[PDB]
Amino acid sequence: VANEPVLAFTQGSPERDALQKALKDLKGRMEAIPCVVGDEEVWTSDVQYQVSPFNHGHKVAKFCYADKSLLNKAIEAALAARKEWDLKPIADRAQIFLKAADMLSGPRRAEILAKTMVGQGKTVIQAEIDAAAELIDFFRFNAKYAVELEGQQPISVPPSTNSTVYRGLEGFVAAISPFNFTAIGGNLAGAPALMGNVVLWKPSDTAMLASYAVYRILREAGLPPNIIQFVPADGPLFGDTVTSSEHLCGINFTGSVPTFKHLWKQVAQNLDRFHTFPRLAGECGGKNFHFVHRSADVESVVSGTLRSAFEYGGQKCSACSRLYVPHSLWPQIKGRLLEEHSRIKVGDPAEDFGTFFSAVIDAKSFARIKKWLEHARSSPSLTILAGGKCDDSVGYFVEPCIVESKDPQEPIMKEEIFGPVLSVYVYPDDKYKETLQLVDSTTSYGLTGAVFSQDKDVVQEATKVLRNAAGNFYINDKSTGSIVGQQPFGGARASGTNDKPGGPHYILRWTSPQVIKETHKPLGDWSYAYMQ
Amino acid sequence: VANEPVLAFTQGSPERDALQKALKDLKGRMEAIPCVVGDEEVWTSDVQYQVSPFNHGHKVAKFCYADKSLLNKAIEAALAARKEWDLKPIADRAQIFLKAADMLSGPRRAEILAKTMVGQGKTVIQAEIDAAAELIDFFRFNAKYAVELEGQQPISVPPSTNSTVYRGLEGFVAAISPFNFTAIGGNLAGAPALMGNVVLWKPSDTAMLASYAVYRILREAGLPPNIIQFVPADGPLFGDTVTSSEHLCGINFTGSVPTFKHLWKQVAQNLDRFHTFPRLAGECGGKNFHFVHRSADVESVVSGTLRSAFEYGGQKCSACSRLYVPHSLWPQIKGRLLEEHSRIKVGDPAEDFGTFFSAVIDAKSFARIKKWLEHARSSPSLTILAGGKCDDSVGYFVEPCIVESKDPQEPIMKEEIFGPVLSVYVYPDDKYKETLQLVDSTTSYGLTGAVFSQDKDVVQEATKVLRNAAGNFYINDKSTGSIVGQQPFGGARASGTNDKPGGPHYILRWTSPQVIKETHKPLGDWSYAYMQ
Numbered sequence A, B: 001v002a003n004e005p006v007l008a009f010t011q012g013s014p015e016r017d018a019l020q021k022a023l024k025d026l027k028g029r030m031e032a033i034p035c036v037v038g039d040e041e042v043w044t045s046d047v048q049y050q051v052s053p054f055n056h057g058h059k060v061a062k063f064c065y066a067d068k069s070l071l072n073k074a075i076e077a078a079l080a081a082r083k084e085w086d087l088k089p090i091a092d093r094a095q096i097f098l099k100a101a102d103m104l105s106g107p108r109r110a111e112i113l114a115k116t117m118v119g120q121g122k123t124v125i126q127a128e129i130d131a132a133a134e135l136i137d138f139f140r141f142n143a144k145y146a147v148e149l150e151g152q153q154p155i156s157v158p159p160s161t162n163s164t165v166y167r168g169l170e171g172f173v174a175a176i177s178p179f180n181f182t183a184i185g186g187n188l189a190g191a192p193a194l195m196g197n198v199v200l201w202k203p204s205d206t207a208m209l210a211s212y213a214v215y216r217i218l219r220e221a222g223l224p225p226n227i228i229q230f231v232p233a234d235g236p237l238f239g240d241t242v243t244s245s246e247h248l249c250g251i252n253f254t255g256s257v258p259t260f261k262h263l264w265k266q267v268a269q270n271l272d273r274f275h276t277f278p279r280l281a282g283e284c285g286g287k288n289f290h291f292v293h294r295s296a297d298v299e300s301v302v303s304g305t306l307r308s309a310f311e312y313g314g315q316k317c318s319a320c321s322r323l324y325v326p327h328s329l330w331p332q333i334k335g336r337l338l339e340e341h342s343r344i345k346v347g348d349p350a351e352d353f354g355t356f357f358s359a360v361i362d363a364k365s366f367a368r369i370k371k372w373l374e375h376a377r378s379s380p381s382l383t384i385l386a387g388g389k390c391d392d393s394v395g396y397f398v399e400p401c402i403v404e405s406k407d408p409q410e411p412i413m414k415e416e417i418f419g420p421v422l423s424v425y426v427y428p429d430d431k432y433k434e435t436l437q438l439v440d441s442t443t444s445y446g447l448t449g450a451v452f453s454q455d456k457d458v459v460q461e462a463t464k465v466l467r468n469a470a471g472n473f474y475i476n477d478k479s480t481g482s483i484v485g486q487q488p489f490g491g492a493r494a495s496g497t498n499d500k501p502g503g504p505h506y507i508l509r510w511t512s513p514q515v516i517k518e519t520h521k522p523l524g525d526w527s528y529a530y531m532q
């Protein structure tokens, strides 16, 4: 298996024509997305709408929230399907995901990209690397890893034969996916299902349109009923309900630190009722760095930092939000960042393929980011160098913002904003070693980080100092854009449990192996020779 | 790597003479075992004694409980040693464990066996398969698996080089080991240390002599100071102290389900203070079955069941405590079980090598078993077929006991006794399929189980029905005695987290990987061609 090729979308290309046609097919249209339990389309009275972030007057989907009753019905029906699905050979379960991957690659590529663009506000290329490439790669690579895992078998010595059976977990898994990557929903529900689990999938409200498209592709690729239940819901009620079920065996979560910790506390509070110990997997965010040494390639620093900080509006757990620059290069880097900043286009990504990034996802995010832009004006240690405006009249539009902090410990250097807000700290060149320690100590997070240096001694030094500051560490590249099979993704500290989805070990969280020993000769006496 | 050969200890063998000399060397002697922080031997006033279970007048060791101050000092010192240990190449960490394995195999074998016999009440062969064979195997196999893991590396695609660094966990690990296997303490503390972690090891009070011998061998094999701190303590105080530390990164536990669930709840209660999400690993109890089909080899049922139920007094999480026999074979199996029962010798294992098993571990365990034996003689559905008496006047001596239940759901069929008490349910031959379901549905546990059948269709059928009733499932063999590398050990339901120590994946719980991407060419423009 190889990584899915990323298409260029050149003027006149078939993929660009297909994508423009799929975008035109969504304009002025709304889909009614039901909850799905088995093959039943279920509607509750608690109706919700998804809107286009860059045109929030456009309702792109109507959906509804599952309540406690419907969620418990979905649990019961999933559990009643699990034994059969777990006994289905892994090669057969894998084939469904490989067929879904082929559909996303070819005939459904334009649709899944367009729904991710219109529903989540992604540009062409951000939709392509997510909803096509990453999702396709998770499905094909996890399928490869799961079939290869069957070959990891114990030793046999006469008179016995040993084997390992890679059972799914007994119970159901709750998959809770974020707004910002179509692919992550596919993986959070898909990887456990591949390993013989049954799943209640609560997709993100602001990603409904594309998340349901992923669900329908999996069902059309042959996923049986009751293996993944499609159950949008209020976050607290979903959490309360799954953590109250005696049958919970896992939570596969991506999102905020506090929500993950809350779910962990709810499981522990109910620990005496579960039939087994639930497995919690959480990817929980970052306050990621780009650290520049005075020997750096300045144009690589500028391009890589502008992409890491501002693509998809900085709405990535991997996005650079703290830049460390030596005094000697600062005038040059500042000049270049301010030059390029003025050439960044923010607008409608469906209508204008010149757009670098579009609106942030929703009103709540827009209000949080606006509070940070107010903080950057109201704080004595902060100076806005570029941007600072926002406008919610049409979409949730925030200009890319570059903020200089005179204080390396300022809250803007520590708290995850999840918006297009880059904080810069200028350090004395002769204090680069002290500044590496500041990079390591300043925040609670451990997710991504980059060092830009042509000086290999500084790279070797920075690599050692920052060993636990970043689970995905980059040398002379940007902190975003991990590729399945190339950079397995995750980190520790407050960033989560670090199960490295995108690598071969992630699937091991979703199997509880059994070992069988068969003895081929009679056993003989209970006593031992030495006892006689 | 091969499994350590199990020696026979027959009259005239070198290992029988060497063991008798080592036993002689312990008779009427006591060791003063300190807490060890770094290389410092530390005493508190909270002195404790380990006694021989078969002769509870004989103190074999004096030790002491670490107080809160000493545990906190142990944590700080371990943390200060962690970075250099984590950076030591895995080949160099492994060589320490391989040297320890060589010492245990050769010059320290008789000592570690004799300390396990006198201190924990094991017979020769139970000491040999534990303190020698299984511990040596853990050390050699985990070393092999850790060096193999290093070779699991991601795909590099120009212009970038990718690598995985198998970092130890950032923080300290608490290892909490049980009385019943010397080897398990070695693995619980040793496997995390192999993977670049630092450890506070709280060994079991009633295994202190042999646990300290393991610790000293590791230090003499080259383990640096402050990698494993030897800190016997009160169980509750140890748990409180380590779960209150913001630096806790893991608990490696073997013991009771209530203690494991308490620790899990304490970690969740403190989750906001930890620098990262602690990893909890728990092996707990079983209520393990031997299921007999009417086609079974009766003599293999009899010998396998007597060994599984009664070796080491049934003090194994894997021990058979429920036997399911078809009516057509019951007169035969009952007669053979009662004849062999009468031939079982219980006595002093050091003085009489004819002993099948000796006293149970301590007064608390004796009292629990005596309470169950009272239940067995005072319950409407139960009858005692053999045994039923106990005597604590010299040692904690319990006769092997066979109980028949007419009720397959009786408490004695469900609850883990951890003593030499076998419960038998006789089922109608034509209800063998309903009885397979009862095996699966009766208890809360999922650890070990066996089917005895020469009918290969019934073996297939039982394998499917009992898929989640046992994590270690045996076909025509007894339910105890897993061998490292051959039967990776563990199970789910209430039996724990099922991380399969003894197999290749267990060490993955003790690493938090980092992935490095190094890009060798400049990054180019931040814009994309399709945007022009």
Ligand SMILES: O=P(O)(O)Oc1c2c(c(O)c3c1[C@H]1C[C@@H]3c3cc4c(cc31)[C@H]1C[C@@H]4c3ccccc31)[C@H]1C[C@@H]2c2cc3c(cc21)[C@H]1C[C@@H]3c2ccccc21
Binding pocket: B367, B368, B370, B371, B372, B374, B375, B411
């Ligand atoms: O249930 P209680 O503890 O109020 O009373 C005693 C009983 C009995 C008994 O011998 C005692 C008690 C009191 C006095 C004696 C005893 C002995 C003990 C304890 C309480 C009691 C504490 C310390 C010791 C013990 C062992 C295991 C769990 C709890 C304890 C009989 C009669 C009764 C009893 C209950 C049971 C059983 C047997 C009995 C079985 C099935 C159930 C049980 C629980 C835990 C282990 C074993 C059993």
